[PDB]
Structures are given as structure tokens and as C-alpha cells.
Amino acid sequence: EAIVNAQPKCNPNLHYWTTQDEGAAIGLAWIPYFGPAAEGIYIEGLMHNQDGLICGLRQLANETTQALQLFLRATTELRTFSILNRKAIDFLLQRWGGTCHILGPDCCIEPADWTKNITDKIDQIIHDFV
Amino acid sequence: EAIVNAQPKCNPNLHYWTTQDEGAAIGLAWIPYFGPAAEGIYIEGLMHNQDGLICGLRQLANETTQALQLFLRATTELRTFSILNRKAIDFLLQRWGGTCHILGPDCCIEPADWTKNITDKIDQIIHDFV
Amino acid sequence: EAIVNAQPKCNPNLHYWTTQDEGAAIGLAWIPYFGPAAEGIYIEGLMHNQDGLICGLRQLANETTQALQLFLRATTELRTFSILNRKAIDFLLQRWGGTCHILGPDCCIEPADWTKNITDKIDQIIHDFV
Amino acid sequence: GRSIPLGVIHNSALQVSDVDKLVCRDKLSSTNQLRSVGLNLEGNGVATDVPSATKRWGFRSGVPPKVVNYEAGEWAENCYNLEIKKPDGSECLPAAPDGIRGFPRCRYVHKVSGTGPCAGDFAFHKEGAFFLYDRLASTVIYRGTTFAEGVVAFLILPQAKKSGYYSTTIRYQATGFGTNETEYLFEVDNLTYVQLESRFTPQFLLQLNETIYTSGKRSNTTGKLIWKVNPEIDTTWAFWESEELSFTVVXXXXXXXX
Amino acid sequence: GRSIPLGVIHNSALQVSDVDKLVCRDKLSSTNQLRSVGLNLEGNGVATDVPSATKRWGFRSGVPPKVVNYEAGEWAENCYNLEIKKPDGSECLPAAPDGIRGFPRCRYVHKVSGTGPCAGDFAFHKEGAFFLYDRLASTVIYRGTTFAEGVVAFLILPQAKKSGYYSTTIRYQATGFGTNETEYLFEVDNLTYVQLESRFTPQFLLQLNETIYTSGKRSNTTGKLIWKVNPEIDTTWAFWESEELSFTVVXXXXXXXX
Amino acid sequence: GRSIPLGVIHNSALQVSDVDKLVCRDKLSSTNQLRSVGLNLEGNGVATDVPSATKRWGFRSGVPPKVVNYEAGEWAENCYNLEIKKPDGSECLPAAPDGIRGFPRCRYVHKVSGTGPCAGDFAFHKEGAFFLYDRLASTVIYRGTTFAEGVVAFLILPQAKKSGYYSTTIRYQATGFGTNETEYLFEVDNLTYVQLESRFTPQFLLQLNETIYTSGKRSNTTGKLIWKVNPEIDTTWAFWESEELSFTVVXXXXXXXX
Ligand SMILES: *[C@@H]1O[C@H](CO)[C@@H](O[C@@H]2O[C@H](CO)[C@@H](O[C@@H]3O[C@H](CO[C@H]4O[C@H](CO)[C@@H](O)[C@H](O)[C@@H]4O)[C@@H](O)[C@H](O[C@H]4O[C@H](CO)[C@@H](O)[C@H](O)[C@@H]4O)[C@@H]3O)[C@H](O)[C@H]2NC(C)=O)[C@H](O)[C@H]1NC(C)=O
Ligand SMILES: *[C@@H]1O[C@H](CO)[C@@H](O[C@@H]2O[C@H](CO)[C@@H](O[C@@H]3O[C@H](CO[C@H]4O[C@H](CO)[C@@H](O)[C@H](O)[C@@H]4O)[C@@H](O)[C@H](O[C@H]4O[C@H](CO)[C@@H](O)[C@H](O)[C@@H]4O)[C@@H]3O)[C@H](O)[C@H]2NC(C)=O)[C@H](O)[C@H]1NC(C)=O
Ligand SMILES: *[C@@H]1O[C@H](CO)[C@@H](O[C@@H]2O[C@H](CO)[C@@H](O[C@@H]3O[C@H](CO[C@H]4O[C@H](CO)[C@@H](O)[C@H](O)[C@@H]4O)[C@@H](O)[C@H](O[C@H]4O[C@H](CO)[C@@H](O)[C@H](O)[C@@H]4O)[C@@H]3O)[C@H](O)[C@H]2NC(C)=O)[C@H](O)[C@H]1NC(C)=O
Ligand SMILES: Cc1n[nH]c(-c2ccc(OCC[N@H+]3CC[C@@H](C(N)=O)CC3)cc2O)c1-c1ccc(Cl)cc1
Ligand SMILES: Cc1n[nH]c(-c2ccc(OCC[N@H+]3CC[C@@H](C(N)=O)CC3)cc2O)c1-c1ccc(Cl)cc1
Ligand SMILES: Cc1n[nH]c(-c2ccc(OCC[N@H+]3CC[C@@H](C(N)=O)CC3)cc2O)c1-c1ccc(Cl)cc1
Ligand SMILES: Cc1n[nH]c(-c2ccc(OCC[N@H+]3CC[C@@H](C(N)=O)CC3)cc2O)c1-c1ccc(Cl)cc1
Ligand SMILES: Cc1n[nH]c(-c2ccc(OCC[N@H+]3CC[C@@H](C(N)=O)CC3)cc2O)c1-c1ccc(Cl)cc1
Ligand SMILES: Cc1n[nH]c(-c2ccc(OCC[N@H+]3CC[C@@H](C(N)=O)CC3)cc2O)c1-c1ccc(Cl)cc1
Ligand SMILES: *[C@@H]1O[C@H](CO)[C@@H](O)[C@H](O)[C@H]1NC(C)=O
Ligand SMILES: *[C@@H]1O[C@H](CO)[C@@H](O)[C@H](O)[C@H]1NC(C)=O
Ligand SMILES: *[C@@H]1O[C@H](CO)[C@@H](O)[C@H](O)[C@H]1NC(C)=O
Ligand SMILES: *[C@@H]1O[C@H](CO)[C@@H](O)[C@H](O)[C@H]1NC(C)=O
Ligand SMILES: *[C@@H]1O[C@H](CO)[C@@H](O)[C@H](O)[C@H]1NC(C)=O
Ligand SMILES: *[C@@H]1O[C@H](CO)[C@@H](O)[C@H](O)[C@H]1NC(C)=O
Ligand SMILES: *[C@@H]1O[C@H](CO)[C@@H](O)[C@H](O)[C@H]1NC(C)=O
Ligand SMILES: *[C@@H]1O[C@H](CO)[C@@H](O)[C@H](O)[C@H]1NC(C)=O
Ligand SMILES: *[C@@H]1O[C@H](CO)[C@@H](O)[C@H](O)[C@H]1NC(C)=O
Ligand SMILES: *[C@@H]1O[C@H](CO)[C@@H](O)[C@H](O)[C@H]1NC(C)=O
Ligand SMILES: *[C@@H]1O[C@H](CO)[C@@H](O)[C@H](O)[C@H]1NC(C)=O
Ligand SMILES: *[C@@H]1O[C@H](CO)[C@@H](O)[C@H](O)[C@H]1NC(C)=O
């Protein structure tokens, strides 16, 4: 489905905070004893509403709430960290959880080059047939 | 292996309780503030002993206990939630953890249609050979 | 990359402890009520420096520390048990997270026997062409 | 060590297997096909009366407790809820950890309060079974928290597929809990008790309680009244398959005959 | 029940989907392509003043709290920090669990201290939103812990891709918290207060606080001084888009006119 | 940030790599091929005496502790167990969290009790190493809980593959712990002590303790006796590769010469 923002307003700019994913540490800063405190581990960024992604994202989070709250109601874990790992597992099972029938719509195997490897060898025996 | 119930008795009917997996909420019932308490989140069901599945299931749970208890003895997690996710991962690694040799017994790739795509094109060049 | 031990010394022998992975229990020893206490669940082993693996392993653990400590700084989990499961997931996504182009370098599908199944049937119609 | 077995349906029958021992025609398309379930020892024919059940549990030190979750369970006829102290007043069982609630479907909740030596840090199941709580299974018993005895199984489901709730609490007093010389009393009120027998069923206890209230055989004294039941009265096979009494009085003991 | 939706970019637009509803050309090559993010209710146009915001929260018993993590968040203009007790002195909110810290980017932290009946074990969001802490989102409010109201989304990222921090604390006193008759006071010092209105913006409160300090209109008495603001003074649309006052005095009430 | 490296065997040698940098001929058929292991700093040649080891640890506030599990470890010659208080009596170290037990294989357990300023909420490893407990590794030190210093590695194993336990506790008293002016005493009994030197090995301390008991050089007084050891006595390279003493006495100090 597509995403229709139906909120009273939208802030089209996203000024965000997170932790750093790339780049090695500088000197001893990676050692907990010498490194920053809890308040100083964050980086910042800013993204604008290209392709309407920011206002779409605000509506997506809003629409996610019902299903997420029903999932939390049914789990007995006090703190849930496994949602994204389970999504990755379900991605793989959807494509590779059964037998992959080549050329079928549910099998992500491309033998396009595999044909040109065999259809180029049509003239490996049919043409050098002296 | 097959499952042999070796218990003194078997209750052949299973009257069960669980949480609901399908169907959207009604109105505001999904909001924790308005929704049911811990005692009212359950649904019920009843299944009979078709194909002997109920008495087989009672024996299966009994036979699972030794291996499950030895796993719990060896883990340092206080509460274990990851058994089924690890089974799913091991399912995928067994079939796709190495190179898939087509036509081999350990490779779940079917090129049956892939043959009839190429064996129908036997008469794409061998027969229009004017 | 290869591993260069750059430590002041290396103990070339590894006298280790762990829990048992294989073999069924003896009698009632699997029952928590009758089994060993926390101090008696361990097995021991000894491995020597064949192929330089022990001194390489000491250097590997040393070099792992920076990236591991930066990961722990960024997580909000109090106790982290999921590192190896996530490695397994990333192994599968790297090879099967997209369309597998047969004969390509990133696709682990071997059709070597699949050729000899079709290249043996070159003389299934080109030779019995009476 | 051993691999945790997995249930799968083949040739119209349940079989034990594992993810490594499946053929290519077996299909797993989402984590929703995997399920963990808890089955009650009740369904295997075990005796469920309080004297028989408590003999399956014992105290032991040196073993850390462990917990595993399960997603669905079975309605129980008999559950148990324990408040045991040492004679010096100290608690024998630990308080329930955060997020662990009582088993959610119990027709009868046998609530036992009393004393015993409790020679061990935790109480375990002597046969290796689990104590089932609200979608969490533990190896030990928690204080004042309703549980059922049971075991856990793990399943792969196939691709395709093909009254209210009443609960009654039955209260007991106990001495010498967890030993060879345990004695039990069924509680009619705070001053009227019945000496317990293994042969007494739940509905026999409930109807015996009713006749006592309606015949006026409760204590009318500051002191405690304990009724005994002679062998030749009748008492109500497994659970899924009056005017006649006479009361004479001899703390204060007495006898109920037919 | 429902499946947790997943955001994906197709045809230069964000769409909702799930891992089971993707075509073969969509590629997921590592868990690093998946992200969980928290978006603030601020960005949707909700009123953020203390009187309006507190009406979205309420107390309820019988529902266990739940927590879910998120990896990245949005800088907030308004956050909240609550210290509410019952009139008998007991705390209304639970202490923050181990490892849960305050939201890390707040331009204004509205710190409310006061009393109310607190008819419930936990305080929830009446509209089903979450209380956002430091990369953990909870369904309930923790005592003295800075939070922002928000919601969570889950994304798959494509293969390719294409000033300092200031925080100011604004303190309030409250009576009848969480009811229909709540009254609020903005705190200038421990003895000088301003009766709060929904129309007061943060910067209006900060500049009103400045004029009071610089005009010498603080209390010079053991007693408490409370200023009221007549309707016809002006007060500073959403957040992303002086000499003139006169003070006369009538506890002790007073009025500030233009 | 950085990717956590992974050990793999190629061309008869261990190499660092990752799951994204493997060729198709590398095979991973189950999660049992992946392992996490803990290696002791001992095996790299670090000094293990109490004065040298404690200088690698220090107190720091503002950093939340973190824990990661590991599946197998190495037998240790030296472990440590700390009971440090401030001079005002308050504890410097936190009690061990639920489920964290001491390291399970220690030939010598150096148990240090004493006082220090402890200028920080938690004690960390100054070189970024971990404190290894029972299959859990932590960034901080827990009170009265035996640990070894070490680091963690992660491995992929190939498809194919190709005496009892004694522990001795050595007790110490310390003042000025965690500073530049720390002083240590080896404890013979509650009233007889030996001034500690970095050059003293474990077996030298154990045999020095034996000669004191067998020569009758313990205190025979209410007061405390402290022996000093002159430089020219001999003391027992890494760990894997008597009648002659004379005691003269000068609290109460003394000297042991050869
Ligand atoms: C899965 O399902 C199986 C089968 O249903 C269960 O098997 C039970 O296993 C337990 C052991 O854990 C058995 O209990 C033991 O029974 C012994 C025999 O009992 C008989 O003995 C007398 C004298 O011969 C008979 O007259 C009488 O009929 C009894 O029935 C007892 O001797 C044992 O008690 C002694 O040993 C224990 C230590 O184990 C001591 O603590 C006792 O004090 C005593 O000295 C013991 O009670 C039980 O009989 C088995 N059942 C069946 C039907 O075979 C598994 O338990 C089950 N798994 C799980 C996890 O539930
Ligand atoms: C995702 O995004 C959507 C859209 O932005 C949000 O939708 C909001 O949903 C809440 C309900 O949870 C709505 O709140 C309710 O509004 C009702 C109507 O308010 C108007 O009513 C008067 C009289 O007609 C109007 O004059 C005035 O303009 C008001 O605006 C109220 O009647 C409701 O209050 C009553 O019911 C509640 C119980 O729900 C009682 O507790 C109250 O005491 C009272 O009796 C209620 O306040 C809100 O209006 C919706 N917004 C919009 C823009 O439609 C979702 O909440 C959001 N999801 C998440 C998770 O954030
Ligand atoms: C992986 O393996 C490597 C190699 O074995 C380890 O490397 C060690 O890293 C630590 C730093 O974390 C080094 O410790 C530092 O050594 C400096 C040099 O020490 C020498 O200095 C004097 C004067 O020159 C020499 O005469 C003498 O021989 C010393 O050996 C010290 O100057 C440092 O101390 C100063 O800085 C620290 C702050 O870091 C202050 O707290 C101190 O008070 C002091 O001011 C410091 O001690 C160590 O030398 C390295 N070893 C080697 C062999 O190179 C990694 O630590 C290891 N990783 C893990 C996780 O274990
Ligand atoms: C006879 C029968 N038919 N169906 C079931 C059944 C089993 C489990 C179940 O779990 C639903 C919760 N759900 C939560 C999250 C989901 C996720 N993966 O996110 C997955 C799980 C629902 C069911 O209807 C049973 C059954 C069998 C044995 C016993 Cl003891 C009790 C019941
Ligand atoms: C938890 C749960 N949910 N749903 C089921 C379930 C039960 C029976 C079942 O049988 C139908 C197979 N049927 C397929 C088509 C035909 C064909 N020729 O294939 C004929 C055969 C399929 C199911 O999915 C279970 C379940 C309950 C108990 C146990 Cl022990 C195991 C599973
Ligand atoms: C506009 C934008 N561009 N980029 C991001 C972004 C999002 C998440 C992010 O997470 C990095 C932490 N990292 C830790 C461990 C990693 C692992 N899997 O190990 C994975 C995650 C880093 C980012 O830069 C955003 C963004 C969008 C919405 C909001 Cl509300 C805030 C920011
Ligand atoms: C968290 C994060 N990190 N990075 C991104 C990201 C943003 C935009 C994006 O657009 C580029 C696509 N671009 C590819 C090449 C061209 C082609 N023809 O394919 C033209 C199109 C790609 C990204 O990876 C996000 C992100 C942020 C907000 C939201 Cl809502 C979703 C994702
Ligand atoms: C030299 C050597 N040979 N073999 C091992 C070894 C390593 C780990 C190991 O773990 C077994 C626990 N097991 C529990 C659950 C299992 C699951 N995935 O369920 C998986 C793990 C068993 C071992 O024998 C070592 C070794 C190497 C370095 C060090 Cl420091 C110590 C020992
Ligand atoms: C934890 C663990 N369990 N088992 C092993 C193990 C050790 C050595 C090993 O070497 C044999 C390879 N051998 C295969 C056949 C031949 C061929 N031509 O392939 C010749 C080569 C294989 C193993 O599985 C380890 C382990 C211990 C330390 C370290 Cl550092 C890494 C792994
Ligand atoms: C594929 O084509 C190459 C030439 O580009 C050829 O060398 C190779 O043999 C072909 N593949 C097979 C399986 O024959
Ligand atoms: C497979 O068969 C279809 C006709 O059904 C044909 O159009 C197509 O080209 C064939 N596949 C290839 C790779 O040629
Ligand atoms: C592969 O070769 C076998 C003979 O070894 C033959 O029977 C079979 O038909 C071949 N495969 C196909 C798809 O024809
Ligand atoms: C407990 O059982 C009997 C009491 O019925 C008693 O005689 C016996 O000695 C006791 N058992 C032990 C091991 O002391
Ligand atoms: C019986 O005793 C319990 C506590 O021992 C008490 O709470 C209860 O009120 C008493 N019942 C009656 C009827 O007094
Ligand atoms: C016993 O009978 C009385 C009288 O009706 C009733 O109130 C009480 O609940 C009964 N006890 C039980 C345990 O059902
Ligand atoms: C008083 O109690 C006795 C038994 O203790 C009972 O038989 C008698 O009926 C009671 N009194 C009345 C008036 O019921
Ligand atoms: C709360 O709201 C008004 C006060 O403004 C009051 O009249 C009303 O009765 C109260 N609501 C309820 C449900 O009592
Ligand atoms: C105001 O009161 C708080 C506690 O009620 C106190 O901590 C603070 O010091 C007081 N402020 C002044 C300026 O006295
Ligand atoms: C109010 O003004 C005084 C005077 O400068 C200042 O010290 C105080 O911090 C201000 N209060 C707030 C909440 O900014
Ligand atoms: C004393 O307080 C009053 C208001 O309560 C204020 O108007 C007056 O200016 C203050 N005194 C001085 C000297 O500022
Ligand atoms: C600690 O080290 C020496 C004591 O040996 C002392 O002179 C020095 O001043 C101290 N270091 C600092 C930073 O004060």
C-alpha cells in the first residue's frame, strides 16, 4: 500500500540524533575508561523532504502503532530487541524456505547468462559438424 | 523417528488457550490504556485426536524434556526466548549454507520447467534448419 | 587480512574449559534436582599450537576488542547474547539476499553436473537423427 | 548434550525430527509456522491430589533457576499455589520475578499454606518436569504463584491447515511439608478443618464443604474443630472420562460416618 | 493481531509493505539495511503546552508495561519530566528501571512537580503513543525521567544512498494532576509564581521570567506571590514555521497588565 | 564504529575476515559452527602480581556497564577477588548482578580487602580489556566476585576437525587502593603479615607462609606483626615456561634475612 499523510501538520525537515556506525576511533577514545559519558556518544544529521520521504515517514510511524502495540501486548519479554532480526529471517524464508522452481515467479534465480552460455554453444556441435 | 506414546493415559482432546494472531482490533481496544487487563487477552480453542496428533503431542513434549533441560543447564541467559528463531536459522543454513549443486540430493533447486524451456527449443534450430 | 601476533609472549598451549555439547546424560543426571551444581557442569580439553592457531587466536581476541567495545557502547541491551546469531543471518543475506545470477561471482550455484546432464543429451536427438 | 527435537507431520502422523533432517519438499515460509506449546502432566494420567503432587517436588541448593517461554497452553483442572515457611517464620520460596504471573486457566486452585524444614535454596521437580506459569516455564516454584505441572514441545506447522471460565480456590494447611511425614488439612473455615486423604477428589471436598455449612457442623467455639472421615464412605478414573452423613464429636477431634 | 508494517522506497516514494510482499529485485544484503526510528508527536502538529499535553496521559491498573528499543530519534523542542505524589506523600510513578535514561535532545524540559489522586498503577498514553527515552520506548511514564511523546517505524534502506546543543529547564507546580480540575503554576523562584495558561509559549515564559527578575517583581516576603496575566496581553503556528508591562498587587495574588 | 571481526582458517592458517568477505567454497551449515571464546591476558605475558595488576584498573563515572557472553574459556593461574571500601565504610564496588558467578578455573585466587578513595561509580579496565566471569564478560568489577582479565574472539569452525582441579586463596590487605601510593600486605594470619613486593610469586608466598608457621614466627601477642623481606633474598619468566632464613624483630616491624 502507499502512504497518505493525514496529520494536521508535517515538519518537512528531520533533525536527527543517533550513534556512529562507521569510522575507527581516535587514539584511546574506544576504551570505556577514557571514552565519552552517556551524554556524549551521539552524532547529528539533517535531511529534507526529498521524494516526500519525511512526511511519509511520520505517517508510517503513526500507522505502525496499532500492530506494534498488539505485538507488545502478546509478548512476555520485558524489553524487545529482536523485531528487525526476525524480519530478516522472514525475508529469507519467503524466498528460500522451499524448493526454488527456476523461471517461476517465487524463485529469485536468474539464468539469463546461463542461457547465453548454452545458446552460444548451439554452434559448438551443430556447426562444427564436418 | 516416529512417536510412541508410552504414558499411563492420554487425554485425546486438547482444550487450549493462547493469544490472538489474526484480525484487527475493534475501535480503541488496541490502546493499552483502554484495552483488556492481563487476564483478558486470551482466546480458546478445541482440537480432537485426528491422525493421533494429540496423543503424539503429549509424548513429544515428554521426550523433549531431557534435551531442553540440558540446554537450559548450559545457557547463562536467565530467560530464553530465542529457541525458535535459532531453529529457523539452522533450517536455512542446512539448505543454503554452502554451494548448491543442481541435481544433487542436498540442493533444493528444481530445473524441471527449466528443461522443458530448453528441451522445447530443441526444435528452435535443429528443425528450422532449412 | 592475516593475523600477526605482536604480543610480548605467547602461551602456545590452550588448556580450556566449557560445557558438553554431545552425548546423552547417564540416568537421572539430566534432572536439575539430581544433577550437578553450578561448579560441576564443565568439561576440559587441551590443544597445541598446530598451524599456529593458538598464538593466532590470542592475537585475534586482542584485535577484536576495539570493535566489540564500540558495539557495546552503542547498544542499550544490558546483556548481549545475539552476536553469533546476527553473524549467521548476515552470512545468509550476503549470498541469498538478492537475485542469484548463475555463473556470476556472487552466486553460489554450481551447474557443473547440470551441464553434463544436458551436454550428455547432445546425442539424444542430434545422433539418433535417422 | 542433545539436539532439541522438533515435531513435524509426515504421512498423516506426527514424527520427531530436526531442521537438519528434513527433505526439500518440507517448506518453512515464515517464523509463524514455528510454535512452542505447553502440555499438562494431568493429560498423562498422573495423580493430582495434593498429597501425591507435593511428593514430586523437593528442595535443592547449588543449581541456578532457568526460565523458557512458550506460546500456548492447555486448560487445567488442577493448579497449585504454595505459601510455605520454616517454623522460625522465614519464607521458603522466593517472590515471583517481574513479569511472571500465574497460570491462566485453572478449574481448581489448590492453595497450600503451612510449614516445613525446606532444606534447600530452591524447590525443583523431582521428575524433571517444569512448573508452568503465564506463558513462561520455570524449573523452580515461586511463592504464592499459581502453576500447573507440565512440559514443552516445539512444532513446525504445515503450509495448509485442517462456555465461560470458572475457577474455585481450595485451601489447605500443612505441617512437615516436603518430608516423609507430611500432614494435610482441608479448610472449611478458619476454625473448622477436615483431615485430608489422597482419595478425596475436588468435587468431593466442595460438596463435603457444602454439607458442613448446611448441616451446621462448623465450630461454635474459640477452638479449632477437626473432622475425620472413616474409610467406608465413598469418594468420587481420570477427570476427562447429601443427607446420608452423620457427625459425632469425640483442639477437638470428631468423626463423620455413613 | 496484525503484521508489523515495513517501510520501503519504490518509484521515488515511500510505501508500506512487508518482507513477504517484496519482489525479487528488492535486495537485502545485511542486517545493517534494517533500521528502527522514533518520530516525535511534535512533528504532527499536536499542542505541546503543559496543560494540553498532560490531558493525553492517564492512570490504569491491570496492564503490564512493555518496552521496545529504537536506534535513532529526532531533536525535540518540548520534553517532559514528572514528579507527582499523592496528597498522603506516596509516589505516583515508578523509578526508572536499570538502563533507561532520559531523552537525549530537548530544547525545553518541562519539569512538573505536584500532587494528584493517581487512580492507577501505571500512567499510559491515552492515544496509544509511546513515551520515548534514550533509544528505548515504553508504554508508561517513569518518575523524574525526561521523555518525548512519539511513535516508532521500521525501514529497509536501499542499496545505494543519496550548531551545538542547548537545553533549558522550565519548572511547574501542579495540583489535581490527571483530573478534570488541574491547576498549574509556572515557577519564577521558590516564592514567586505565575498562573499558567495554555496559550503561553516556552519563550514567552522565559522572557516573562526575565522581566520579573529585572523589574524587581519577585517576592520580598516569607510568603508566596502569584502573578496573574490578563487576557489582553499578547503571547508568542508550529515551532518550525520588554518595558511595556505593568505590575500591581492586590498567599498573595496580583495582576500584570499592558 | 567498526565491524566485529571473525576468525576463519584458510591455507592452514587463522585469518581475520567477516561473513560478507567469504567465498562460496566456505560453508556454514549450522549455528554450531560459530563459537565465542575468552582468552586470558596471562597468555600474552602481562605481569600478574597484585601490585602490577591493580594498576590496570580505575574508577570512572558516567559510563553505563555492559555485559557480553562467551561460551568457553581458558584455565587461569591468577584470578582476583576484591572487597574495597571507602575509609567512611561505604562499599566501593557493586554486588554481583543475578546470574553472574566467579570465573570457574583459577589456580590462585588473590583476594584483596582494604580501603581507597574510589573516585568513580564503577571500576573499568584502563587498557580496554574485559573482566571475565562465568561465561559472561563485563566492562566493570563486581564486589567479592572472582574474575580473570581477558578478551573475546569469534570463530567459524571448519566442517571437519582435527589431572584434577586445585585452587588456593591468597589473602591481602591494602590501603590507598587505586592511587599512586598503594601499600599491600600478605596475610599469614589475622595478626601476622608480610610487606608485599611485586617480585613475589604465588609459590614464594605459599612457601614463605609455610616456613613462618613451621618456624613459629607468628605473632604471640594481641598486636599485629609485620615482617619485611630484605632485597638480597631470592624469589621464584612466564608461568608456563627452607631452613636458610633468619628472623629478627625490631604494631611491630621485623626483618627476614638470608
Ligand atoms: C515422561 O514419561 C515417563 C513415562 O510416563 C515418565 O517416567 C517416570 O519417571 C519417574 C522417574 O523420574 C518414575 O518415578 C520413579 O518410579 C519408581 C518406581 O515406582 C514404583 O515402585 C514401587 C516399588 O516397585 C511400585 O510398587 C509402584 O507401583 C511404583 O509405581 C520409584 O521407585 C522412584 O522412586 C524412588 O526413587 C526416587 C528417585 O528417582 C526417590 O526420590 C524416591 O524417594 C524413591 O526412592 C520414582 O518415583 C516414574 O515411575 C516413571 N513413570 C512411568 C509411567 O514409568 C517421565 O517422568 C516423563 N518425563 C517427564 C519430564 O515428565
Ligand atoms: C495517528 O494520527 C491520527 C490522526 O492525526 C491520530 O488520531 C487521533 O485519535 C484520537 C483518538 O485516539 C482523537 O482524539 C479524540 O478526539 C475526539 C474528537 O475531538 C474533537 O471533539 C470536539 C467535539 O466534537 C471538537 O469540537 C474538537 O475540535 C475536538 O478536536 C474526542 O472527542 C476524544 O475525546 C473523548 O474521548 C476520549 C476517549 O478516546 C476521552 O478520554 C475524552 O475524555 C473524551 O470523552 C479524543 O480526544 C484525535 O482527535 C485524533 N486526531 C485527529 C487529527 O483525527 C492518532 O491518535 C495517531 N496515532 C497515534 C498512535 O498517535
Ligand atoms: C592488545 O595488545 C597490545 C600489545 O600487547 C596492547 O598494547 C598495550 O596498550 C597499552 C595502552 O592501552 C600500553 O600501555 C601504555 O604504555 C605506555 C608506555 O609504557 C612504557 O613507558 C615507559 C616510559 O617510556 C617505559 O620505560 C616502560 O617500559 C613502559 O613499558 C605508558 O606510558 C602508558 O601509561 C601512561 O598512560 C596511561 C594512559 O594510557 C596513564 O594512565 C598512565 O598513568 C601513564 O601516564 C600505558 O601504560 C601498553 O604498553 C601496550 N603494550 C604493548 C606491549 O605495546 C593492548 O592493550 C592489547 N589490547 C587489549 C584490549 O588488551
Ligand atoms: C491444537 C492447536 N491449534 N492451534 C494451536 C496454536 C498453537 C500456538 C499458537 O500460538 C499463537 C501465538 N503466537 C504469538 C506470536 C506468533 C509469532 N511467531 O509472532 C506466534 C505464536 C496458536 C495456536 O492456535 C494449537 C495448540 C497446540 C498445542 C497447545 Cl498446548 C495449545 C494450542
Ligand atoms: C498448531 C496448529 N495449527 N494448525 C495445525 C494443523 C493441524 C492439523 C493439520 O493437518 C492438515 C494436513 N492436511 C493438509 C492437506 C492434506 C494433504 N494431503 O496435505 C491433508 C493433510 C494441519 C495443521 O496446520 C496445528 C497443529 C496442531 C497439532 C499438531 Cl500435533 C500439529 C499441528
Ligand atoms: C534521515 C536519516 N538518515 N540516516 C538515518 C539513520 C537512521 C538510523 C541509524 O541507526 C544507526 C545505528 N545503528 C546502530 C547499529 C547498527 C546495527 N544493525 O548493528 C544499525 C543502527 C542511523 C542513521 O544515520 C536517518 C534517520 C531517520 C529517521 C530518524 Cl527518526 C532518525 C534518523
Ligand atoms: C536511514 C537512511 N539511510 N539512507 C537513506 C536513504 C535516503 C534516500 C535514498 O534515496 C536514494 C535512492 N536513489 C538511489 C539511486 C537512484 C535510483 N534510480 O535507484 C535514485 C534513487 C536512499 C537512501 O539509502 C535512508 C532513508 C531515510 C529516510 C527514509 Cl523515509 C528512507 C531511507
Ligand atoms: C581449542 C578448542 N577446541 N574446541 C573448543 C571449543 C570452543 C567452544 C565450545 O563451546 C561449546 C558450548 N557450546 C554451547 C552451545 C552450543 C550452541 N551453539 O548451541 C555452542 C557452544 C566448545 C569447544 O570444545 C576450543 C576452545 C577454543 C578457545 C577457547 Cl578460549 C576454549 C576452547
Ligand atoms: C573450536 C574448534 N573445534 N574444532 C576446531 C578445529 C581445529 C583445527 C582444525 O583443523 C583441521 C582442518 N583440517 C581439515 C582437513 C584437512 C583439509 N585439507 O581440509 C586439513 C585441515 C579444524 C577444526 O574444526 C576448532 C578450532 C580451534 C582453534 C581455532 Cl584457532 C580454530 C578452530
Ligand atoms: C561459459 O562460457 C565460457 C566462455 O565465455 C566458456 O569458457 C564456458 O565453458 C561456458 N560454461 C560452461 C559450463 O561450459
Ligand atoms: C521459456 O519459454 C517461453 C515460452 O513459454 C519463451 O518465450 C522463453 O524465451 C523461454 N525462456 C528462455 C530463457 O528463452
Ligand atoms: C540427468 O541424467 C540422468 C541419467 O544419469 C537422466 O536419467 C535424467 O533424465 C537427466 N536429467 C534430466 C532433467 O533429463
Ligand atoms: C522418611 O520415611 C520414613 C517415614 O515414613 C522414615 O522411617 C524414614 O527413615 C525417612 N527416610 C529417611 C531417608 O530418613
Ligand atoms: C482467616 O484467616 C486469614 C489469615 O489467617 C484472614 O485473612 C481471614 O480474614 C480469616 N477469615 C475469617 C472468616 O476471619
Ligand atoms: C463452602 O461452602 C460455603 C457455603 O456456601 C461457601 O461459601 C464456600 O465458598 C465453600 N468453600 C469452597 C472452597 O467452595
Ligand atoms: C455447634 O457445633 C457442633 C459441632 O461442634 C454442631 O454439632 C452443632 O450443631 C453446632 N450448633 C448448632 C446450633 O448448629
Ligand atoms: C470532570 O469534568 C467536569 C469538571 O470540569 C465535571 O463537571 C465532571 O463531572 C467530571 N467528570 C466526571 C466523569 O465526573
Ligand atoms: C527551592 O526548593 C527546592 C526544594 O523544594 C530546593 O532544593 C531549592 O534549593 C530551593 N531554591 C532556593 C533558591 O532556595
Ligand atoms: C529566570 O531569570 C533568571 C535571571 O536571569 C535566571 O537566572 C533564571 O535561570 C531564569 N529562569 C529560567 C527558567 O530560565
Ligand atoms: C517588593 O515586592 C513587590 C511585589 O511583591 C515589588 O513591586 C517591589 O518592587 C519589591 N521591592 C523592591 C525594592 O523591588
Ligand atoms: C601520584 O604519583 C606520585 C606519587 O608517587 C605523586 O608525586 C603525583 O603527584 C601523583 N599524581 C598526580 C597526578 O597527582
Ligand SMILES: *[C@@H]1O[C@H](CO)[C@@H](O)[C@H](O)[C@H]1NC(C)=O
Ligand atoms: C580473621 O578475621 C575474619 C574477619 O575479619 C574472621 O572472619 C576470621 O575468623 C578471623 N580469623 C581467625 C583465625 O580468627
Ligand SMILES: *[C@@H]1O[C@H](CO)[C@@H](O)[C@H](O)[C@H]1NC(C)=O
Ligand atoms: C599457610 O600455612 C598454614 C600451615 O599449614 C596453612 O594452614 C595455610 O592454609 C597456609 N596459607 C595459605 C594461604 O596457603
Ligand SMILES: *[C@@H]1O[C@H](CO)[C@@H](O)[C@H](O)[C@H]1NC(C)=O
Ligand atoms: C613468639 O613470637 C616471636 C616473634 O614475634 C617468635 O620469634 C617466637 O618464636 C614466638 N614464640 C615461640 C615460642 O615460638
